[PDB]
């Protein structure tokens, strides 16, 4: 599988803290290792994980830009917070992949609510390669697939626009009131 | 993990003969061997019509609930499913992740966003034996054009093999 040549997508999602960032670096690192040219896509320049590693990037403002800043001599692009990217961002994913190239996305599956996220949603249903991969519960400590959002400690309200902290938590402790 | 009224949703996707309906089969019986009630349903073991329906049929007993097809339920599935998940059960769903155009099919971009269990598996591509990851729909053995409505066969491919004229 994966010969030369042959284009695809993976998708890593999960909550908060789940370990996207940790796994997108891993994946990267391996990549040089095996001497592809890879290219590293960020939002508005390191993709950092909240346990200690980062790797160069380059910020972008929206998909577009990706084509813009895109090297044909690439064999690899990798992005980091995809949740925040606009919808375009499917098409061009699948054009790189459609060109034998691979992609690697990692971003929210959900909003603090609960609700789909963004792209990921679409970029899930299309990617060949699909790791849903679960946080710690920080109240119950079994695996937390939910990010909660609170405000003052107290959970936030399902109309709530964007003294504010967030956490992983599993589907049994995470409270989002409406 | 997964203890006693602690439910979630579980989804199994890919394209036509990945073995979707083989691996919700094998779950059931493994529910069944555990002593859990489960009720089955379809897009028409209870075929019905619409997501508004499942609720209908519930009984409040079963422990895990089964959906087939899922990509051809109205978007009112996932909350549904959710419901269901968030009353402690399980729910399994099974469903074709794209159309044969290769594009997002229904409600399955936001029945995998909620997930807590997605698993994307594969067919084998009956032109060049890799992994197949689309279904191929043929007319007269040719290739069905991107905009064309519902001889006619499907098959498995992959994706350098699937075709989609536009
Ligand atoms: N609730 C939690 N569950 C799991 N890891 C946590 C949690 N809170 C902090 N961490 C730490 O933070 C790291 C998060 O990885 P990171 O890649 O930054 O997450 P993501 O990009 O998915 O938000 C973990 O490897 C772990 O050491
Ligand atoms: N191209 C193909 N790739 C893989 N299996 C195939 C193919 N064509 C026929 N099969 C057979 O059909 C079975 C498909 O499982 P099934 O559950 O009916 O698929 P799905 O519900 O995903 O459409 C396989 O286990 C295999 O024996
Ligand atoms: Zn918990
Ligand atoms: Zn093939």
Known sequence: YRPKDHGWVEVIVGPMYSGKS???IRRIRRAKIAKQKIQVFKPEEDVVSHMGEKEQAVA???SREILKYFEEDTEVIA???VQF???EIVEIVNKIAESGRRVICAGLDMDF???PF???PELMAIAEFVDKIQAICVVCGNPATRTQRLINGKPAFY???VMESYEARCRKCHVVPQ
């Open 113 to 115: 609510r609960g609700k």
């Open 159 to 161: 109309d709530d626009p």
């Open 79 to 81: 992005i980091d917070e």
């Open 85 to 87: 990217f606009d919808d």
């Open 60 to 62: 972008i403002k929206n």
């Open 118 to 120: 963004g792209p990921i």
């Open 22 to 24: 940790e796994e997108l």
